[PDB]
Tab-separated table of C-alpha atoms in Angstrom:
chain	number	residue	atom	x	y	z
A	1	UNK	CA	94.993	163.644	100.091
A	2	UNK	CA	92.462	161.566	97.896
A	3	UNK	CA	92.965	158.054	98.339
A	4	UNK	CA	94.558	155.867	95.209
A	5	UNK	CA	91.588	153.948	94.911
A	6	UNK	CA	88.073	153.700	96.171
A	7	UNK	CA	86.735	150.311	96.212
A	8	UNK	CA	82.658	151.308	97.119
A	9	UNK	CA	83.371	152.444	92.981
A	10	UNK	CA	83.770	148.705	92.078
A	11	UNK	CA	80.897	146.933	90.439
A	12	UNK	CA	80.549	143.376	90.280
A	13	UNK	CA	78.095	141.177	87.961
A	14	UNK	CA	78.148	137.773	85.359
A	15	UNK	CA	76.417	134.258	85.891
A	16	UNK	CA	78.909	133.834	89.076
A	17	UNK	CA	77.230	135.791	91.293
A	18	UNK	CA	73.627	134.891	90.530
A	19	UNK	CA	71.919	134.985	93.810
A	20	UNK	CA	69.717	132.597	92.153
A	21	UNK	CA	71.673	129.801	91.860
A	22	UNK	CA	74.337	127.986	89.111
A	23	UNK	CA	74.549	124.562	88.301
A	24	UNK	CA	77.331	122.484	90.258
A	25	UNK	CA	79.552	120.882	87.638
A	26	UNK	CA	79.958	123.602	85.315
A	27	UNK	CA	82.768	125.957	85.358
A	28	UNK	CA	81.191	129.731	86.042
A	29	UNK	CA	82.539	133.187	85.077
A	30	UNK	CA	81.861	136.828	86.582
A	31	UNK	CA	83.013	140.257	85.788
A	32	UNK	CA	84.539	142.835	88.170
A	33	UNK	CA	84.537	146.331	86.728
A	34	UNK	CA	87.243	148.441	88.723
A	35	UNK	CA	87.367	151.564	85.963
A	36	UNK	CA	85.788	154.439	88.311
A	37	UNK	CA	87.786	152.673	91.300
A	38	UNK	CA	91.150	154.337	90.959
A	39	UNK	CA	94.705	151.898	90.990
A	40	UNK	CA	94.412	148.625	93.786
A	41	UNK	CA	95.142	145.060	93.481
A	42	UNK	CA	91.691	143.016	92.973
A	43	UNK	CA	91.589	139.660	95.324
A	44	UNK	CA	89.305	137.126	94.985
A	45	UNK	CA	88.249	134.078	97.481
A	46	UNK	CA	86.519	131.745	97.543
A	47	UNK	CA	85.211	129.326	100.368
A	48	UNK	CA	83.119	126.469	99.109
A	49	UNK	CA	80.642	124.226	100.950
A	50	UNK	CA	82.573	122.660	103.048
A	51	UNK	CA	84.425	125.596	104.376
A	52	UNK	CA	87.744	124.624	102.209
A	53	UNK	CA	89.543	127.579	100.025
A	54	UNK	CA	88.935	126.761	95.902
A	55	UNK	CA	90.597	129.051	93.412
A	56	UNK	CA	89.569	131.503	91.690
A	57	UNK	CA	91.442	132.716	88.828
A	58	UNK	CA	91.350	136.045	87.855
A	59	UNK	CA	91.840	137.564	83.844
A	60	UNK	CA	93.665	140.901	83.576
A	61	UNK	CA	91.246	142.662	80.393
A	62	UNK	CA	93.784	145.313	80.016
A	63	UNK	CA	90.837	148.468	80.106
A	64	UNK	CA	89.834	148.367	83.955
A	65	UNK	CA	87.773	145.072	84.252
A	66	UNK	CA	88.423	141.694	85.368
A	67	UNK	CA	87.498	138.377	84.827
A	68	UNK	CA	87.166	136.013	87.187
A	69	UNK	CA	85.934	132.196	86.739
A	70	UNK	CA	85.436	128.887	89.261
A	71	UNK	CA	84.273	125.576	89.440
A	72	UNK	CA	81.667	124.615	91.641
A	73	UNK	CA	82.523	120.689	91.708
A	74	UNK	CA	79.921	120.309	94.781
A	75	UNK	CA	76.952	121.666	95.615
A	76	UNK	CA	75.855	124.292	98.448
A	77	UNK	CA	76.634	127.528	98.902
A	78	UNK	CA	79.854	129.428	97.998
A	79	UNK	CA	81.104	132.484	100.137
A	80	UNK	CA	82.869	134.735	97.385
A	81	UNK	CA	85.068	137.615	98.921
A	82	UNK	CA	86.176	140.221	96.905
A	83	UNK	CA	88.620	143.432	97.945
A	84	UNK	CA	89.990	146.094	95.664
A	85	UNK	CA	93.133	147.611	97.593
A	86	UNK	CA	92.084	145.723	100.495
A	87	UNK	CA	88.809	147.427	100.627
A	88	UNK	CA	85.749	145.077	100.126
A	89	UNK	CA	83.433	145.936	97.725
A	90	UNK	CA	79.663	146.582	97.469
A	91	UNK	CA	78.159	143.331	98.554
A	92	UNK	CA	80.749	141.285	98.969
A	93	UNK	CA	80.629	138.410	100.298
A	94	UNK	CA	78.674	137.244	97.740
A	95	UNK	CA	76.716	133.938	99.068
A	96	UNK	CA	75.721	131.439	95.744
A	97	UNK	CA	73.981	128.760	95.956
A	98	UNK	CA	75.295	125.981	93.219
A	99	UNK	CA	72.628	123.652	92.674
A	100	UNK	CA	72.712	119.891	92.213
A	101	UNK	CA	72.088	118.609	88.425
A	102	UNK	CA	70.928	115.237	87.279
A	103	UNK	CA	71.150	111.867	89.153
A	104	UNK	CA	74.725	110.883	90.584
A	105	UNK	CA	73.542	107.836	92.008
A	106	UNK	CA	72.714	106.673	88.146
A	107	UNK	CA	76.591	106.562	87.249
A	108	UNK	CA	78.832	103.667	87.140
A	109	UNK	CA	82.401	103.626	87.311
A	110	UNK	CA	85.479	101.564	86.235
A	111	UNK	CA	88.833	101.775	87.265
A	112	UNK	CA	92.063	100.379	85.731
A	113	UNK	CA	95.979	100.034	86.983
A	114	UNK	CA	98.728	98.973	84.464
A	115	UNK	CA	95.814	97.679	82.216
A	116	UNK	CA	94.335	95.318	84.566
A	117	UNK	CA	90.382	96.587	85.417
A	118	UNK	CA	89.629	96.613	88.955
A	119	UNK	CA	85.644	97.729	89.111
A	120	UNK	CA	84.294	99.995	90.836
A	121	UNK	CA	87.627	99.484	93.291
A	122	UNK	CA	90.592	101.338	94.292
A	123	UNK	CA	93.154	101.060	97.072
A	124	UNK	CA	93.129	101.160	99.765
A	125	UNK	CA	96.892	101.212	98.915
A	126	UNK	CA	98.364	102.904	95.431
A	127	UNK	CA	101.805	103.149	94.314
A	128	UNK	CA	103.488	106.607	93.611
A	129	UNK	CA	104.000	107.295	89.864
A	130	UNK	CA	101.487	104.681	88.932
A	131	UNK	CA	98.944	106.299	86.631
A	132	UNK	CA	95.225	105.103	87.449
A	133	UNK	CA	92.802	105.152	85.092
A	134	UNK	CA	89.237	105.525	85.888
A	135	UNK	CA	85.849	105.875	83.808
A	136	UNK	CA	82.670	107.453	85.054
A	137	UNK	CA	79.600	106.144	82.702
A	138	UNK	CA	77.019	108.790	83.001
A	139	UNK	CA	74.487	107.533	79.736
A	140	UNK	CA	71.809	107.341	82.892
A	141	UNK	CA	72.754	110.611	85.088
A	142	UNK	CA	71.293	113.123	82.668
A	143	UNK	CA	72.112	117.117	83.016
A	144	UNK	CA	75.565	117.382	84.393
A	145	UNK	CA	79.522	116.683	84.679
A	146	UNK	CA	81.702	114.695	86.185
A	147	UNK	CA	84.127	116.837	88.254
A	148	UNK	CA	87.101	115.205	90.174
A	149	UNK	CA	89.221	116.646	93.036
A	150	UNK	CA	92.101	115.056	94.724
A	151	UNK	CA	92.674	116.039	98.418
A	152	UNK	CA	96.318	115.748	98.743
A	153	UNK	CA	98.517	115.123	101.491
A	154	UNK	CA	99.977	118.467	101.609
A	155	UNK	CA	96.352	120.201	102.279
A	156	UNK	CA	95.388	121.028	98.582
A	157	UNK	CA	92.479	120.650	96.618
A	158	UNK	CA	93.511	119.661	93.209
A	159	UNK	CA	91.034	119.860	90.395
A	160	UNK	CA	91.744	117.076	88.042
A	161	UNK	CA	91.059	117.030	84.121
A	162	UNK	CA	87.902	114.946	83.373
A	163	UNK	CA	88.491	114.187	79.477
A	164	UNK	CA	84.928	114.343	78.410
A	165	UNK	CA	84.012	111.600	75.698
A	166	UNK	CA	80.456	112.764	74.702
A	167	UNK	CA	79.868	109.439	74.952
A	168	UNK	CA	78.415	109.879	78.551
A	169	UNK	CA	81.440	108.614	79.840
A	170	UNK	CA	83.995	110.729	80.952
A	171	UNK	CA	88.089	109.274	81.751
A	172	UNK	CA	90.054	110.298	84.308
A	173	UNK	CA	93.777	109.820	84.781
A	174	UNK	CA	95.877	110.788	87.746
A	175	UNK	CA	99.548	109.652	89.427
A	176	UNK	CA	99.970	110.429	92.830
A	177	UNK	CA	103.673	111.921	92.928
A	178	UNK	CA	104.185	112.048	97.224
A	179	UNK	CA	103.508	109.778	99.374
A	180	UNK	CA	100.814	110.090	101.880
A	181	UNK	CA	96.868	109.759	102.360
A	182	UNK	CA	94.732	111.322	98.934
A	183	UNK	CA	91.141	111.477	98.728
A	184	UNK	CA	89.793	110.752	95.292
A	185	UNK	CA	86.249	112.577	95.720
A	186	UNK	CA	84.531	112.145	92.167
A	187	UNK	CA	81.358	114.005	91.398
A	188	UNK	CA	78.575	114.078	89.116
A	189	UNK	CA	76.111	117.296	88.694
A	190	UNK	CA	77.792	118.537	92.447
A	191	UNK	CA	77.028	114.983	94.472
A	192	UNK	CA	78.980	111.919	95.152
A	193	UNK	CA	78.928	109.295	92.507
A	194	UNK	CA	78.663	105.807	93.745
A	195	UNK	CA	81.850	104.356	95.885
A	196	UNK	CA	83.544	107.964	95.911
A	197	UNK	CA	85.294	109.569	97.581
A	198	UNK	CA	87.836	106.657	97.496
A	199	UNK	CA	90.288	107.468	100.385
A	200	UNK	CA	94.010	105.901	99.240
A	201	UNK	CA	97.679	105.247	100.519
A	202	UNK	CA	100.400	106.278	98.001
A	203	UNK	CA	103.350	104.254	98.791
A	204	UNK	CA	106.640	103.076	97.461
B	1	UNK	CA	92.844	37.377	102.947
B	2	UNK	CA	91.078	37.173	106.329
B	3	UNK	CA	90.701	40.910	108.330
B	4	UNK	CA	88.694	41.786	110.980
B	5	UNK	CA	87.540	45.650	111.157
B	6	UNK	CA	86.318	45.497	114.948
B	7	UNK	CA	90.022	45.025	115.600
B	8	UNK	CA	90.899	48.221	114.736
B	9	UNK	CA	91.614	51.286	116.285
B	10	UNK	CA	92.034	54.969	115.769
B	11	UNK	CA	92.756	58.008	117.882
B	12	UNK	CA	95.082	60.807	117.824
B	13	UNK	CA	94.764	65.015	117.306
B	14	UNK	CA	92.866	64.533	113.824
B	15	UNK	CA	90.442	62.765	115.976
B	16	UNK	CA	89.829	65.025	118.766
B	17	UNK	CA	86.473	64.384	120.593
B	18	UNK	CA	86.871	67.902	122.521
B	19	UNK	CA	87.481	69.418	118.836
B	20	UNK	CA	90.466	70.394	116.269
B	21	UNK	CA	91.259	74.095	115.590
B	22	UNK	CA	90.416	75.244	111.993
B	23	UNK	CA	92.935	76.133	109.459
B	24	UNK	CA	95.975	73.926	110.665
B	25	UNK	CA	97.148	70.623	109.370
B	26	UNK	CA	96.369	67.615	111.609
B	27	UNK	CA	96.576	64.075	112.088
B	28	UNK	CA	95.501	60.864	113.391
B	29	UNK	CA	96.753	57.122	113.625
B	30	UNK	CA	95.030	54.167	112.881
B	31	UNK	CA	96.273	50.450	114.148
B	32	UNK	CA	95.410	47.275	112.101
B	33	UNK	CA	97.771	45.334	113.856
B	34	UNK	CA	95.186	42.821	115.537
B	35	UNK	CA	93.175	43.356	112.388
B	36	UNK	CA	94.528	41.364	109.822
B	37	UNK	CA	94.896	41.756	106.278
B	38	UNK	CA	92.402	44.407	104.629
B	39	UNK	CA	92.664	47.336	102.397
B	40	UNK	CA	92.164	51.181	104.756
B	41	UNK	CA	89.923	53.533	103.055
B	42	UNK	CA	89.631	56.959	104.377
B	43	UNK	CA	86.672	59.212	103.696
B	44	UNK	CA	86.194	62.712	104.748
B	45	UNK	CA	83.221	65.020	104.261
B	46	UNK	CA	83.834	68.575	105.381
B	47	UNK	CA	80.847	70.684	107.224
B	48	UNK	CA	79.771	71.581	103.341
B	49	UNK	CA	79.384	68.345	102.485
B	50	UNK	CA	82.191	68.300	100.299
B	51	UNK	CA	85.065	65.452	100.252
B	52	UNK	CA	88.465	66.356	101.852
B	53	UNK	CA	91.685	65.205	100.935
B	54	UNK	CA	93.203	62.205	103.301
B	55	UNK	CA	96.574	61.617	103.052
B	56	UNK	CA	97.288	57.768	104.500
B	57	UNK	CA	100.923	56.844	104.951
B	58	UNK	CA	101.207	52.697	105.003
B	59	UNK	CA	104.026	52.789	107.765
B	60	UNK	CA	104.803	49.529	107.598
B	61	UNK	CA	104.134	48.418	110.812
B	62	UNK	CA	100.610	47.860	110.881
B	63	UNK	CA	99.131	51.184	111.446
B	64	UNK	CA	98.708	54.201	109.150
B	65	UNK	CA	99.319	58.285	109.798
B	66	UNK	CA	96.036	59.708	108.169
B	67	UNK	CA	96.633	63.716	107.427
B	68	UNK	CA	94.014	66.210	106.603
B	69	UNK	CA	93.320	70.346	106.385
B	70	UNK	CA	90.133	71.336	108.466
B	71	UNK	CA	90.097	74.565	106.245
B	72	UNK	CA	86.438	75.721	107.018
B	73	UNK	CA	84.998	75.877	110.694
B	74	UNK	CA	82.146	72.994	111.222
B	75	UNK	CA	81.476	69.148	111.457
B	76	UNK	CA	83.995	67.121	109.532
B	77	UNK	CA	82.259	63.222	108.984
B	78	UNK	CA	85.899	60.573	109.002
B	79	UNK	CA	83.974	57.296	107.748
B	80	UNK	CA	87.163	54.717	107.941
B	81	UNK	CA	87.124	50.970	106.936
B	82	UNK	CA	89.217	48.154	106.961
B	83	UNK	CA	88.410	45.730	104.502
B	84	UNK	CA	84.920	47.087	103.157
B	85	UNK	CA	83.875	47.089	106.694
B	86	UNK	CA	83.564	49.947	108.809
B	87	UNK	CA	85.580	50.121	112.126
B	88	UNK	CA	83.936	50.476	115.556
B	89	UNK	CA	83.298	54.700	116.380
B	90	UNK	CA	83.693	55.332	112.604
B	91	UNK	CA	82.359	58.018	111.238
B	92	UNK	CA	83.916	60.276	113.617
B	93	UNK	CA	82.625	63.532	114.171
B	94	UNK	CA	85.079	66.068	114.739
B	95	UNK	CA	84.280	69.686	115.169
B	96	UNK	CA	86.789	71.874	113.556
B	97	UNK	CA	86.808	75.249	115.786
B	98	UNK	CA	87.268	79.112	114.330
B	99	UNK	CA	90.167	80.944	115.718
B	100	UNK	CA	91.540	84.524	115.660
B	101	UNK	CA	89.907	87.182	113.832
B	102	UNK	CA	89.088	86.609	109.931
B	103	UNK	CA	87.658	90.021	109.503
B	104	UNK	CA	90.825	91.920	110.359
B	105	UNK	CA	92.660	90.207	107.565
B	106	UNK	CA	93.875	92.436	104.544
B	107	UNK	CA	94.035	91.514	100.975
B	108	UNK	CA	96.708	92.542	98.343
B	109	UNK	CA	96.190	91.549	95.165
B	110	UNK	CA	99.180	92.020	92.583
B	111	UNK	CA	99.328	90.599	88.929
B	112	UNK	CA	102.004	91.395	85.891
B	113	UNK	CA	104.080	93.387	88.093
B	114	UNK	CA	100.919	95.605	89.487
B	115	UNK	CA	99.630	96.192	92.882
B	116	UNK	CA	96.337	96.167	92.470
B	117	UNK	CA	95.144	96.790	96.163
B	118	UNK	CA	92.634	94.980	98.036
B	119	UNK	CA	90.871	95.008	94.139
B	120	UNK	CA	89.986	91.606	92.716
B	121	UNK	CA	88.761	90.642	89.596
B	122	UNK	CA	85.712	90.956	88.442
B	123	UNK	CA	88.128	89.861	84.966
B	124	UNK	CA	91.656	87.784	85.513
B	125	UNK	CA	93.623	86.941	81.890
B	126	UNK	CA	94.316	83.043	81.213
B	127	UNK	CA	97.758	81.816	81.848
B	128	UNK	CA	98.587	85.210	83.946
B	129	UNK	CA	99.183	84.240	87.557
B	130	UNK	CA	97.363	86.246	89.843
B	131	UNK	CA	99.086	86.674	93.596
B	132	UNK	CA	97.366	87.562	96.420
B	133	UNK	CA	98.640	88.343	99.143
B	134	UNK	CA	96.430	87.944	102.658
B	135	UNK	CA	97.547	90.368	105.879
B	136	UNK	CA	96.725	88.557	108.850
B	137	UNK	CA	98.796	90.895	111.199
B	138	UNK	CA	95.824	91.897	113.279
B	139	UNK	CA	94.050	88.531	113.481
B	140	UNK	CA	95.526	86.240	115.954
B	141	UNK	CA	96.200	82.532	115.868
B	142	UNK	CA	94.961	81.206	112.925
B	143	UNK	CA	96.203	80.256	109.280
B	144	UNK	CA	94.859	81.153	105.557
B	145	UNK	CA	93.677	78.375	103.506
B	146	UNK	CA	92.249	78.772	99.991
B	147	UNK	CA	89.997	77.009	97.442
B	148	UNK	CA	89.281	77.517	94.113
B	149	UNK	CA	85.948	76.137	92.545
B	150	UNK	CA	86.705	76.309	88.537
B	151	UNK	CA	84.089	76.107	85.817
B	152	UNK	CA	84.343	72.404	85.923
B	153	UNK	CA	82.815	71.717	89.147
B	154	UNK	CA	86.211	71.149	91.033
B	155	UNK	CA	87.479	71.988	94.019
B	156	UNK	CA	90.684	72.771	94.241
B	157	UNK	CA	92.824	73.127	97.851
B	158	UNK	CA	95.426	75.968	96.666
B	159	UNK	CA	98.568	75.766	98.921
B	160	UNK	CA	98.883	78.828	100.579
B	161	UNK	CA	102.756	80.192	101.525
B	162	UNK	CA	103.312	81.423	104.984
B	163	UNK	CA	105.745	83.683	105.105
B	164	UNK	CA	106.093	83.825	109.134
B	165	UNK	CA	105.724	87.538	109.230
B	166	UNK	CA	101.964	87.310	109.539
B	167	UNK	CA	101.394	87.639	105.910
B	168	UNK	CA	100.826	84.778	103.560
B	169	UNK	CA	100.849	84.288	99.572
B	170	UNK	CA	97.963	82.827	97.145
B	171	UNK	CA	99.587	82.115	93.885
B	172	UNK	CA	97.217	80.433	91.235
B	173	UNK	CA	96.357	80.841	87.286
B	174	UNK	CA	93.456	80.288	85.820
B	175	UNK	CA	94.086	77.418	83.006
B	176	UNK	CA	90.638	77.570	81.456
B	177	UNK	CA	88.069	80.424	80.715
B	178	UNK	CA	84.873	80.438	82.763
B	179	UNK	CA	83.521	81.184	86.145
B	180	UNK	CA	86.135	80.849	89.466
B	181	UNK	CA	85.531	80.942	92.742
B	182	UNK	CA	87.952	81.851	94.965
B	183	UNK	CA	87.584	81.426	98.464
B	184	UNK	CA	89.861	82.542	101.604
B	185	UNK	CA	89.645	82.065	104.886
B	186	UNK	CA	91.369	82.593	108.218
B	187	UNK	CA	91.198	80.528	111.365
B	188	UNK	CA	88.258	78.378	109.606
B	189	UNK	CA	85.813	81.522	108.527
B	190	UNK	CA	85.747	83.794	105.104
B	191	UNK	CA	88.164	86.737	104.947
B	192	UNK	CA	86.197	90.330	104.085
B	193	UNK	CA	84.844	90.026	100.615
B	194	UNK	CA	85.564	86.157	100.437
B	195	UNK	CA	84.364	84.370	98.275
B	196	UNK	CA	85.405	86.551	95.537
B	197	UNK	CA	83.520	85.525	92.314
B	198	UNK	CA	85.942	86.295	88.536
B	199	UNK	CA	85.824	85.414	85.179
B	200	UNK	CA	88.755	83.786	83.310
B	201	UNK	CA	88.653	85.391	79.698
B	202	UNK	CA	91.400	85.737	76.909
């Protein structure tokens, strides 16, 4: 009996799996092409830097091929697994490097409760369903983002909307909903921006 | 309207030659009984060089209660005189000692409704009161005391509420736009961060 599918038929390719690096900050795309493979479920992980599981989200085309796209918010390497039917692929894992953009260190940021600016301050205390409000002025950090990623009490990685201004500022809002310890980690070009991460207390 | 200064005497906890612990209330007595008739002045200089409140209850009696905060750790200079004329040991030099531990002291800041954290300033509103709230659960024996210096020059002793739980409460508004400084200690020495520098604006 022939097997269903046949993963060593799976070919892989895109600016995701350069081998010769990607710029942390920027959202990244690759294509899996599973058309001479046969019928299998295509899974995708991702282990980033610091040896934590980010998502990777993967596009149905509809003809055979898939889509899959990340965001490498820090820089270092990224260990991409990919298995068709369980079966790993031709050179999976993929190891890729994201590279650090710009000058972090050259950003200053704001933050703001109910209104009332703090600076560059936060916690260490927050209160659950408050909405914080904080501004990353990057006019000095040249080529890059600002990426922000909430470690949660519950173990998750949350990748939180950074409304880009084009002013070289970016906002960010978030509202802790549990209680518990966060970290607010806040990047710029894949590295720390001054004061982060900011480790809080949601309470009340 | 005849007085005699080298009459007079003064001793008691305010005046403590083996030293005073910072950041409580304390006081002294003075006795003008063999003295005479004479006015009592009272003049403190903290270890900043800066006068210091002295409260001087007439009792009546011939003596006085003199009252005074030792807020800050250091050399406080009592000059006292009875008639224009010094009295014999004055100034006394009392050395105001630190207690407990200043540095494990937590700040809270809250204003409009807001917790704020241990955030303050760099920008407080006129007219909003501004509360902060100083954690002192970890730092021993010792009291908060606060000051505010306000574009003015003055220096203002801000009464500071202790609410017995090892927590006390800093209420004060800023009346006036300019520069404020607001200083906090514990036990006689700055809490983390104090002073913390803000600017009153509209």
């Amino acid at each position: 009996p022939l097997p269903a599918h046949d993963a060593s038929k799976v070919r892989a390719s895109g600016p995701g799996l350069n081998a010769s690096g990607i710029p942390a900050s920027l959202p990244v795309e690759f294509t899996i092409d599973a058309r001479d493979a046969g019928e299998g479920l295509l899974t995708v992980q991702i282990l980033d830097p610091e040896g934590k599981p980010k998502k990777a989200n993967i596009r149905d085309n509809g003809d055979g091929t898939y889509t899959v796209s990340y965001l490498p918010d820090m820089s270092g390497r990224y260990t991409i697994t990919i298995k068709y039917g369980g079966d790993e692929i031709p050179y999976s894992p993929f190891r890729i490097h994201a590279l650090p953009t710009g000058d972090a260190s050259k950003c200053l940021v704001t933050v703001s409760i109910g209104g009332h600016g703090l600076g560059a301050c936060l916690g260490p205390r927050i209160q659950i369903g408050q909405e914080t409000v904080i501004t990353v002025d990057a006019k000095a950090a040249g080529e890059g983002k600002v990426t922000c990623t909430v470690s949660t009490p519950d173990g998750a990685e949350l990748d939180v909307d950074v409304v880009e201004n084009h002013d070289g500022t970016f906002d960010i809002y978030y509202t802790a909903p549990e209680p518990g310890k966060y970290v607010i980690t806040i990047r710029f070009g894949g590295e720390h921006i001054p004061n982060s991460p900011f480790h809080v207390l949601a309470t009340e």
